[PDB]
From Swiss-Prot, chain A:
Membership in a protein family: Belongs to the peptidase T1A family.
SUPFAM superfamilies: N-terminal nucleophile aminohydrolases (Ntn hydrolases)
Keywords on record: Acetylation, Cytoplasm, Nucleus, Phosphoprotein, Proteasome
Phosphoserine modifications at: S4, S11, S13
Protein name: Proteasome subunit alpha type-2
Alphabetical list of InterPro entries matching this protein: Ntn_hydrolases_N, Proteasome_alpha, Proteasome_alpha-type, Proteasome_asu_N, Proteasome_sua/b
A single BP term in Gene Ontology: proteasome-mediated ubiquitin-dependent protein catabolic process
UniProtKB/Swiss-Prot annotation, chain B:
Localization (cell): Cytoplasm; Nucleus
Protein name per UniProt: Proteasome subunit alpha type-5
UniProt record similarity statement: Belongs to the peptidase T1A family.
GO cellular component, one term: extracellular exosome
InterPro entries cross-referenced by the UniProt entry: Ntn_hydrolases_N, Proteasome_alpha, Proteasome_alpha-type, Proteasome_alpha_type_5, Proteasome_asu_N, Proteasome_sua/b
Record has Transmembrane as a keyword: no
Swiss-Prot record, chain E:
InterPro entries: Ntn_hydrolases_N, Proteasome_alpha, Proteasome_alpha-type, Proteasome_asu_N, Proteasome_bsu_CS, Proteasome_sua/b
Record Pfam families: Proteasome (PF00227), Proteasome_A_N (PF10584)
Name of the coding gene: PSMA4
Protein name per its UniProtKB record: Proteasome subunit alpha type-4
Gene source species: Homo sapiens
Primary residence: cytoplasm
From Swiss-Prot, chain F:
Gene, per the UniProt record: PSMA7
Post-translation changes: Phosphorylation by ABL1 or ABL2 leads to an inhibition of proteasomal activity and cell cycle transition blocks.
Pfam families with a match to the protein in the record: Proteasome, Proteasome_A_N
Name the UniProt record assigns to this protein: Proteasome subunit alpha type-7
Effect upon mutating Y152F: Displays impaired G1/S transition and S/G2 progression
GO biological process: proteasome-mediated ubiquitin-dependent protein catabolic process
Entry-linked CDD domains: proteasome_alpha_type_7
Subcellular location, record wording: Cytoplasm; Nucleus
Lineage, top ranks: Eukaryota, Metazoa, Chordata, Craniata, Vertebrata
Function: Component of the 20S core proteasome complex involved in the proteolytic degradation of most intracellular proteins. This complex plays numerous essential roles within the cell by associating with different regulatory particles. Associated with two 19S regulatory particles, forms the 26S proteasome and thus participates in the ATP-dependent degradation of ubiquitinated proteins.
Taxonomic source organism: Homo sapiens (Human)
Residue(s) carrying N6-acetyllysine: K226
Induction: Down-regulated by the ribozyme Rz3'X. Up-regulated in colorectal cancer tissues.
Length: 230, 233, 234, 232, 234, 234, 200, 213, 216
């Protein structure tokens, strides 16, 4: 049982062939924006299903890691769910040994640590989910993104998934360092509104904020509320 | 490629019939069982003359009354020579007696065709032991020498040649031995080494000879005994 | 031939493509013949001398306390398999304190050599045993094979050009279930004396036989003791 | 080269190491099993090679738990292997739960054993179709048949082997439900002698009210009574 | 299966290691961060990723990592691997303390990390750690010293060696080996980085001391705007 | 847990992984040693370490415990593992028998170790080759040269580096009895032998001597110059 | 059991008695309580008749493996050291033994003393055994390094003669060994009664 | 809490002459105060020329004879040579020692004859210490039979009787009288000793009864 | 040892010209409390061998499922070859010696008997592994009480008919009803003959309390 040989390896050019394919599988994923704001963040994403047939209260893409840290993805479906499982477990190891909710930076350390050995270690392919992190952690909010390589960077705004160059350029245009509450939600909504493939339905987007009282998903009556206030 | 535990479209294993080769590579050794002993010799093929020739161990004494003579891929035998002597003193330990030669040869040849890729813990072997050797030994049955293969096949032998001279020296040895020692089998075996000669007229620097006689235990020959024999030819 | 990485694969017709090729690897081995009477079963083997001269790589083996074998294929792998068969036959001497019956013996080695046929990167035990023993009923004789498929046979011959020995031995089954030891082993040696390359003699050197049955231990007849078995001219 | 490994699909979803094992029982002889109201009757074709093999040289009607049976088709090494681990499986059931093993659970258990053994490149699939069969006092004459794919179905008159293309037709035209197994032991020879189109030294075993949940090679008399269905 | 393995731990027919010198070409794609020692302490001088505004605050950067009170390390190549190994080697540092109550003289640490990284290129079939990271440090035994290592495994005292693209030859015409006077080492560092620049797109960090204990400074913002106007010509 | 058999027999008895290690020792430094009958002496033409090396950590010359010391040649990072395990088991052999550990035994441990990596499952046998010099309880300045096939020879020059077939044929020519004196003719023979290959010892060569179970002394480039000058003067 | 050993200018005498008790009933009057591990060294036994016999038996195996493996005679400090290693790593398990490891080597007469607790000391003279301290007394009254061969033999015979006379758990015979730079020899198999009539 | 040993009793004797070895026995195995059976042999025919006696705890005596029997067979066709007697004594010494820390509580005596033909007899403690002798009964009446054939065989504490070597008539009459004496005086008597006697031509086995109480 | 285990008391048996008869009382005595009355302690195995139990009954249910599973397993190999009562005795011996060898011992102390091909068999297997053969056996206090009546008649004549042996063990079982405290009235008597194993339970003992009214 098992293989115990790495399938991720170095090209003759000198680069990882599987990781750039993982960033291709991320770049073919659903678009998701994340905006660091002066008191709190907003992590919006786009839930377009096949038909109007499914339960849009069944699966989530905003979902917390146990205290005040939500994380949203773009790319492969269930590999995300594995990273939520591992991330909740690592946050609870940290909580049972140090008796505080985990600093966001350390959670990104350990999630980027567990995503690294799937670029090695016996036949496993890398995850191909570049999920991004939020978190209030004391004083000022944080935001990160763990690539399927294992790198991570903190910033003020980003996008990912489909056509993310337009998201990074557009958020580079419209960002202010004091831009703080629901205005961030506003520009997040008009970053997903940029493509969306049509009509901007409230059941096809969900956002999550970290407004100094724990990460919480937004109820579907609140997104449609600001979709009435467009 | 293909692995080690696969059979060849000829009929045998790949790694075994490849382990019959790298026995043509390497030095040549010969042995003659007689009625009052068994003589072993090997032309250990010194490369340069800038050097010390009396530390190329190709006649190795397993016990006091078993001496082996390896060839081929040298120093691959040291694990199974180690198993030969550890098994020897285990036999003397647990049973308080001497051994046969088919018990050490029985014990070593079990380790020959015992390898594989995916098996137990990685202290196992990958390639087969590419070293053919033969245990010259004296027993309470008789003096005898057991020619091994890398396949684990071991046979009774009284006149056996290994190494690169496994055809011409074996065919020469086929017609010159029938009777007994009477001191001249060791002088009619280096004569076969004298026909074999690769680099040098077989002086007491490039051949190692050792006999196992039932009166003594063994005798790894020193230099003046060797060149005492070479002077007689 | 992409079926060379190959005791996991199947040829597209039905073939597993190398554990029948281990059956080739015991067709290549030396010839032998065993048979059974109503009372005692015998084994007869000719021993190849690929050297100066030798004990000719002694074939038939003592495993037992009346369950004797006759190997024909790889020799180190044969010795591994008879250290298995030997050790658990003595284990059935230890625990149950009865003679281990021959059928359960050959069946559980038929389940022991069947495991590397199953799994990955492990060659089959390329040896064709020709085991023979006397349990409670008549003296059984089992060919087993590297394909782990034994046969409750009578009067079987396996090895190099042993098919001619079978076709002698197939048309002379009528004088079995009689034909005591002195005239039985003659009837097996003149069955063995067809696998030889048509030049005249079952010598005392190369022929080693084994006898097992009623009121006698599995007894090996070597270079000397085969000389009282002498007859036939063809 | 989407072949040669059981962990790799086809480009239309068809694991070729399973269907290559399926023809690997289609090149082996037949073994029919006929259900009726008092039990299940097996019958196996034999393809006796030489005269050197004696009667029952290779058993192909094994038994497992003193009531279920093992009419096998393919490689006898693999079939004998899963026969003995079926013996160990009913051993763990009877030792574990006390109650004598119902056959549906044994067929599902051996079925998922040989199926879960076809999910890995580190093993080959089995090359042996086989069928079970018994009845408890309140079970009904349960029999099941298991492919090398690992699928197990309850049948009435299933037939595996080389000539199952012929053998399924006569079992379908035979009256299936309401006869009392002794005649169908006799009638099994008619199926075996039809499907053998070339020593055919056949062999039968069953479980029935003449057995009370057991197995016997026939007892031995229908071998000289169902032999009298020559000339049909 | 043996058809699937990349076979990383194989010598080339030219004798070299294919997966190791592919890591050496991974350094030349992304890599900066030279290091200069003096009679006084040692400094790294580094480059960030690009001009992309969208970056709020790094506590330490993604380049300079703290290891003890008296050591630090900088990183080239693949940044996902080295993070792991630097936490790994950080563990090594602390357990030397647990074994010895010493602040781990840095050559012990570099030797340990190079032994485990050599162990990943020796066996296990995995890809090697694609990072040629380097180290600065101090011990009571030797002076201020920097070491430099690579994914092959060897290392050395590399008094002014840089890593990554555009390879250090100018430094081996400019470094005065006797005395260096660390302010002028900053000047030489912004010379080399000025040829290969405020703290938006540079990351320079020094190691100095006061009264025995070492001080690792990351050279906060306005010091870089001092040194960037310390040129006219260069 | 990687279990692929790497070091396998190809056809014509050629064990390709080991000969690939033979080019891997053919593509190294140029180590050389002389058994000079009361002294032993080494030398390895080093590269441009003066430009910016640290001479303390460029050592092809190490020390095992006090008397035995070796000069590896090839891959320069798989060697250091063999250095460490040689030092460890050398201290264990000081634990059991408590001797000034004989050079024969430790070089049998090195050759047995590399032969144990020509056997195990998937770990690439080393690309190093040693010069185990030293002494024993009674003088006897024995030299040993190992091999990636684990074959050690007790020869007296063994120039086994990269351009050292010319050095070993030179040392075949010019070592009979003129170097039986204390140190000067022996060290002159070594620095003559490496000045055959490259240039002057002010940048290139470094040596080490060992005298009668004391004082393993390296030679700084000020002292090497005197010998070089004498050789030049000739 | 009362063994004894002392070195001087000509090798070392190793002497021992020959009785083997079973608490109070005694088994044999003739026990070979000196193990001849090779024709250059020896080794004694001082209690736990299967323990000491097994561990000098196994010491004979290990030292013979050293003879084959490093083609030299084993140094006596190596044999005593590895004995102390193995019976050290069975310490506390009820193991009880004690021995001389004498024998000439390339440095000295040897005579190390290794027991169950793992002392492993060098020595000039020892006498381990059940009573055995009687032997200490009488041996250390007549011992000097400047002895010749014959009164050294009489020093051992009188020494463990009195140590077998006064002690209860000793007696039987006395064998005596004088090893030097050829290997051990045997000089006696006398019993206690003939020594008693020999010396009144 | 369990006491995994009992003392099933039994006394077994072996005498080494010059071409024979009288391995005596007894029969009655018994613990506590009730006897179990009167059939049980204690001399086991190992080879044609080696006979063990085996007394003490009977179940561990039995398993020990299974181990030394099965490993004698494991030797015999691993070297194509039967065991000698001293090699039986050696490997039984390391079987008895190999399980030391939960020991084989069994006193066993190995009779038989050597390679040259002269008889030998090896004695054992329950942890393994072999000495060759010409007497030494063992196991229940160990301290009862021993001083008689210290005198009538070894001739110790005895002046010039002009002692002759033993034979199959003097030593034959020397085994029956000591077991009727120990039948009188020991409690673990035996009712019928079965003297497995070994000779050069082969082996026979005389039986004669005792004091049955 | 740790708890009041549920025990029996005695399985006494004697062999006879013909077969061998063993007998035991049905009792599940929970340490001076007859907690289980109708409880069979006589195992049937294959048609030529029998088996009892005297000590712990839970370990006897363990042994009846491993003996039962082993004998049906080797029973369904076909090829004849059932277990002679050699092999049940020897396997049970090695099971118990290999069970106390790890100090986790089976606590029951049984007697197995059976009629082989030629003659009968009656073997004892102890808690510790003390195993032997005897013409007549008894376990527990029967080994103190039934054993004198058994090795008195069998010292006079070592040949018994079936009715003499059956009345003999009925009388011995009556004696154990009189003297053994952990003994119950009804008992299974059970005989294996040439025709096989048969168990005739349960029986009774005709008690003789006529000496009671002479006590003053």
């Amino acid at each position: 049982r098992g293989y115990s040989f790495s399938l991720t390896t170095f090209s003759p050019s000198g680069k990882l062939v599987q990781i750039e394919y993982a960033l291709a599988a991320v770049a073919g994923g659903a678009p998701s924006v994340g905006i660091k704001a002066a008191n709190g963040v907003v992590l919006a994403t786009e839930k377009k299903q096949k038909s109007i047939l499914y339960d849009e209260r069944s699966v989530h893409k905003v979902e917390p890691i146990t205290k005040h840290i939500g994380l949203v993805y773009s790319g492969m479906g269930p590999d995300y769910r594995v990273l939520v499982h591992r991330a909740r477990k690592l946050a609870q190891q940290y909580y049972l040994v140090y008796q505080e909710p985990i600093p966001t930076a350390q959670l990104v350390q350990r999630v980027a640590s567990v995503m690294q050995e799937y670029t090695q270690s016996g036949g496993v392919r890398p995850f191909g989910v570049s999920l991004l992190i939020c978190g209030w952690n004391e004083g000022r909010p944080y935001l990160f993104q763990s690539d399927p390589s294992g790198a991570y960077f903190a910033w003020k705004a980003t996008a990912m998934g489909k056509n993310y160059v337009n998201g990074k350029t557009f958020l580079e245009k419209r960002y202010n360092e004091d831009l703080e509450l629901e205005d961030a939600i506003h520009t997040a909504i008009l970053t997903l509104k940029e493509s969306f493939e049509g009509q901007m339905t409230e059941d096809n987007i969900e956002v999550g904020i970290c407004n100094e009282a724990g990460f919480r998903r937004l109820t579907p009556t609140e997104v449609k509320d600001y979709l009435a206030a467009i | 490629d293909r692995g080690v535990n696969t059979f060849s479209p000829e009929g045998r294993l790949f790694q075994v019939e490849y382990a019959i080769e790298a026995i043509k590579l390497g030095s040549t050794a010969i042995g003659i069982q007689t009625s009052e002993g068994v003589c072993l010799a090997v032309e250990k093929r010194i490369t340069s003359p800038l050097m010390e020739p009396s530390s190329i161990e190709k006649i190795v004494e397993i016990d006091a009354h078993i001496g082996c003579a390896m060839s081929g891929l040298i120093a691959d035998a040291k694990t199974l020579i180690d198993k030969a002597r550890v098994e020897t003193q285990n036999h003397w330990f647990t049973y308080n007696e001497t051994m046969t030669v088919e018990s050490v040869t029985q014990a070593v040849s079990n380790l020959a065709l015992q390898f594989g890729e995916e098996d137990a813990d990685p202290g196992a072997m990958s390639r087969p032991f590419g070293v053919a050797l033969l245990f010259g030994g004296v027993d309470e049955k008789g003096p005898q020498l057991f020619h091994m293969d890398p396949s684990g096949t071991f046979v009774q032998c009284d006149a056996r040649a290994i190494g690169s001279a496994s055809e011409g020296a074996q065919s020469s040895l086929q017609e010159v031995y029938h009777k007994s020692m009477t001191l001249k089998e060791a002088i009619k075996s280096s004569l076969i080494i004298l026909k074999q000669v690769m680099e040098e007229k077989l002086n007491a620097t490039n051949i190692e000879l050792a006999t196992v006689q039932p009166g003594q235990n063994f005798h790894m020959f020193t230099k003046e005994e060797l060149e005492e024999v070479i002077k007689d030819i | 031939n992409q079926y060379d990485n190959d005791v996991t694969v199947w040829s597209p017709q039905g073939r597993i493509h190398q554990i029948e090729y281990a059956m080739e690897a015991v067709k290549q081995g030396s010839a032998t013949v065993g048979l059974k009477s109503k009372t005692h079963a015998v084994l007869v083997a000719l021993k190849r001398a690929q050297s100066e001269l030798a004990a000719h790589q002694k074939k038939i083996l003592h495993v037992d306390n009346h369950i004797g074998i006759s190997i024909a294929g790889l020799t180190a792998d044969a010795r591994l398999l008879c250290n298995f068969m030997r050790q658990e036959c003595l284990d059935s001497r230890f625990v149950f304190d009865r003679p281990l019956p021959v059928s359960r013996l050959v069946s559980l080695i038929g389940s022991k050599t069947q495991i590397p046929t199953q799994r990955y990167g492990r060659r089959p035990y390329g040896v064709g045993l020709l085991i023979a023993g006397y349990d409670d009923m008549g003296p059984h004789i089992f060919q087993t094979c590297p394909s782990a498929n034994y046969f409750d046979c009578r009067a079987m011959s396996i090895g190099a050009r042993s098919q001619s020995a079978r076709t002698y031995l197939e048309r002379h089954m009528s004088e079995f279930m009689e034909c005591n030891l002195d005239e039985l082993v003659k009837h097996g040696l003149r069955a063995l004396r067809e696998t030889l390359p048509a030049e005249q003699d079952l010598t005392t050197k190369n022929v080693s036989i084994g006898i097992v049955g009623k009121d006698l231990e599995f007894t090996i007849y070597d270079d000397d003791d085969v000389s009282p078995f002498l007859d036939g001219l063809e | 080269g989407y072949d040669l490994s059981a962990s790799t699909f086809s480009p239309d979803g068809r694991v070729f190491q399973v269907e290559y094992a399926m023809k690997a029982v289609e090149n082996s002889s037949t073994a029919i099993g006929i259900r009726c109201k008092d039990g299940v009757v097996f019958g196996v074709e034999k393809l006796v090679l030489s005269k050197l093999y004696e009667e029952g040289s290779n058993k192909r009607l094994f038994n497992v738990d003193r009531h279920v049976g093992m009419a096998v088709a393919g490689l006898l090494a693999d079939a004998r292997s899963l026969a003995d681990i079926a013996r160990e499986e009913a051993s763990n059931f009877r030792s574990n739960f006390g109650y004598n093993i119902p056959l549906k659970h044994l067929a599902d258990r051996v079925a998922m054993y040989v199926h879960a053994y076809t999910l890995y490149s580190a093993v080959r699939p089995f090359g042996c179709s086989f069928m079970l069969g018994s009845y408890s006092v309140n079970d009904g004459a349960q029999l099941y048949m298991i492919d090398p794919s690992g699928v197990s179905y309850g049948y009435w008159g299933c037939a595996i082997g080389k000539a199952r293309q012929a053998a399924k037709t006569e079992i379908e035209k035979l009256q299936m439900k309401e006869m009392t197994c002794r005649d169908i032991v006799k009638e099994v020879a008619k199926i075996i002698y039809i499907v053998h189109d070339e020593a055919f030294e056949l062999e039968l075993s069953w479980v029935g009210e003449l057995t009370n949940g057991r197995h016997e090679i026939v007892p031995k008399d229908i071998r000289e009574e169902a032999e009298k269905y020559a000339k049909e | 299966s043996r058809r699937y393995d990349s076979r990383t731990t194989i010598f080339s027919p030219e004798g070299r290691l294919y997966q190791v010198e592919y890591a050496m070409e991974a350094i030349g794609h992304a890599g900066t961060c030279l290091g200069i020692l003096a009679n006084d302490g040692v400094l790294l001088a580094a480059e960030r990723r690009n001009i992309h505004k969208l970056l709020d605050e790094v506590f330490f950067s993604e380049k300079i990592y703290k290891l003890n009170e008296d050591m630090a390390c900088s990183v080239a190549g693949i940044t996902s691997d080295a993070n792991v190994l630097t936490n790994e080697l950080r563990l090594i540092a602390q357990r030397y303390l647990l074994q010895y109550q010493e602040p781990i003289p840095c050559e012990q640490l570099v030797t340990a990390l190079c032994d485990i990284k050599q162990a990943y290129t020796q066996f296990g079939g995995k890809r090697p750690f694609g990072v040629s990271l380097l180290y600065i440090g101090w011990d009571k035994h030797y002076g201020f010293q920097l070491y430099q290592s690579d994914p092959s495994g060897n290392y050395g005292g590399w008094k002014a060696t840089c890593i990554g693209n555009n390879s250090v030859s100018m430094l081996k015409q400019d470094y005065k080996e006797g005395e260096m006077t660390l302010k002028s080492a900053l000047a030489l560092a912004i010379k080399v980085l000025n040829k290969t620049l405020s703290a938006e797109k540079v990351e320079i960090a020094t190691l100095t001391r006061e009264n025995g204990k070492t001080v690792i400074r990351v050279l906060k913002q306005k010091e870089v705007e001092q040194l960037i106007k310390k040129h006219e010509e260069e | 847990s990687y279990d692929r058999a790497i070091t396998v027999f190809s056809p014509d008895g050629h064990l390709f992984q080991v000969e690939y290690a033979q080019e891997a020792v053919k593509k190294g430094s140029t180590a050389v040693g002389v058994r000079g009958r009361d002294i032993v002496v080494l030398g390895v033409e080093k590269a441009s370490v003066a430009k910016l090396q640290d001479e303390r950590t460029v050592r092809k010359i190490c020390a095992l415990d006090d008397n035995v010391c070796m000069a590896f040649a090839g891959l320069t990072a798989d060697a250091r593992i063999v250095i460490n395990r040689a030092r460890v088991e050398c201290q264990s052999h000081r634990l059991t028998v408590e001797d000034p550990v004989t050079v024969e035994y430790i070089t049998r441990y090195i050759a047995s170790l590399k032969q144990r990596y020509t056997q195990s499952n998937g770990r690439r046998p080393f690309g190093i080759s040693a010069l185990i010099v030293g002494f024993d309880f009674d003088g006897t300045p024995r030299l040993y040269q190992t091999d990636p096939s684990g074959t050690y020879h007790a020869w007296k020059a063994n120039a086994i580096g990269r351009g050292a077939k010319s050095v070993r044929e030179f040392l075949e020519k010019n070592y009979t009895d003129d170097a039986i004196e204390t140190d000067d003719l022996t060290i002159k023979l070594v620095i003559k032998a490496l000045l055959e290959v490259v240039e002057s010892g002010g940048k290139n060569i470094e040596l080490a001597v060992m005298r009668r179970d004391q004082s393993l002394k390296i030679l700084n480039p000020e002292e090497i110059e005197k010998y070089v000058a004498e050789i030049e003067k000739e | 059991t009362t063994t004894l050993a002392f070195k001087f200018r000509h090798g070392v005498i190793v002497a021992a008695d020959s009785r083997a008790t079973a608490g109070a009933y005694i088994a044999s009057q003739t026990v070979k309580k000196v193990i001849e591990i090779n024709p250059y060294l020896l080794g004694t036994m001082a209690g736990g008749a299967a323990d000491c016999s097994f561990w000098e038996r196994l010491l004979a195996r290990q030292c013979r493996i050293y003879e084959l493996r490093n083609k030299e005679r084993i140094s006596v400090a190596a044999a005593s050291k590895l004995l102390a290693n193995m019976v050290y790593q069975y310490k506390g398990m009820g193991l009880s033994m004690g021995t001389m490891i004498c024998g000439w080597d390339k440095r000295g007469p040897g005579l190390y003393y290794v027991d169950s607790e793992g002392n492993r000391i060098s020595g000039a003279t020892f006498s381990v055994g059940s009573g055995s301290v009687y032997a200490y007394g009488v041996m250390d009254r007549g011992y000097s390094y400047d002895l010749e061969v014959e009164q050294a033999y009489d020093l051992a015979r009188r020494a463990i003669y009195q140590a077998t006379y006064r002690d209860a758990y000793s007696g039987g015979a006395v064998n005596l060994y004088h090893v030097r730079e050829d290997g051990w020899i045997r000089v006696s198999s006398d019993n206690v009664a003939d020594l008693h009539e020999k010396y009144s | 809490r369990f006491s995994p040993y009992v003392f099933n009793g039994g006394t077994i004797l072996a005498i080494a002459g010059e071409d024979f070895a009288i391995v005596a026995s007894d029969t009655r195995l018994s613990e506590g105060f009730s006897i179990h059976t009167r059939d049980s042999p204690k001399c086991y025919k190992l080879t044609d020329k080696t006979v063990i006696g085996c007394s003490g705890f009977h179940g561990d005596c039995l398993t020990l004879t299974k181990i030394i029997e099965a490993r004698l067979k494991m030797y015999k066709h691993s070297n194509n040579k039967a065991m000698t007697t001293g090699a039986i004594a050696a490997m039984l010494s390391t079987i008895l020692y190999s399980r030391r820390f939960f020991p084989y509580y069994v006193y066993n005596i190995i009779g038989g004859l050597d390679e040259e033909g002269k008889g030998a007899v090896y004695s054992f403690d329950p942890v393994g210490s072999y000495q060759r002798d010409s007497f030494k009964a063992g196991g229940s009446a160990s301290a009862m039979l021993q001083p008689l054939l210290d005198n009538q065989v070894g001739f110790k504490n005895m002046q010039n009787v002009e002692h002759v070597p033993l034979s199959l008539d003097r030593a034959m009459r020397l085994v029956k009288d000591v077991f009727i004496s120990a039948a009188e005086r020991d409690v673990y008597t035996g009712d019928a000793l079965r003297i497995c006697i070994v000779t050069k031509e082969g082996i026979r086995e005389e039986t004669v009864s005792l004091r049955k109480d | 040892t740790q708890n009041p285990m549920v025990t029996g008391t005695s399985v006494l048996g004697v062999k006879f010209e013909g077969g061998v008869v063993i007998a035991a009382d049905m009792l599940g005595s929970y340490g001076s409390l007859a907690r289980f009355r109708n409880i069979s302690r006589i195992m049937r195995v294959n048609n030529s061998t029998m088996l009892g139990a005297s000590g712990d009954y839970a370990d006897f249910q363990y042994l009846k499922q491993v003996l039962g599973q082993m004998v049906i397993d080797e029973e369904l190999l076909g090829d004849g070859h059932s277990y002679s009562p050699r092999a049940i005795h020897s396997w049970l011996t090695r099971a118990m010696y290999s069970r106390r060898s790890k100090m986790n011992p089976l606590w029951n102390t049984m007697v197995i008997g059976g009629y082989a091909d030629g003659e009968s068999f009656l073997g004892y297997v102890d808690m510790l592994g003390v195993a032997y053969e005897a013409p007549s056996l008894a376990t527990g206090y029967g080994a103190y009480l039934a054993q004198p009546l058994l090795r008195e008649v069998l010292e006079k004549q070592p040949v018994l008919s079936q009715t003499e042996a059956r009345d003999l063990v009925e009388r011995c079982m009556r004696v154990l009803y009189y003297r053994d405290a952990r003994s119950y009235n009804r008992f299974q008597i059970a005989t294996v003959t040439e025709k096989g194993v048969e168990i005739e339970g349960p029986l009774s003992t005709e008690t003789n309390w006529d000496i009671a009214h002479m006590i003053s």
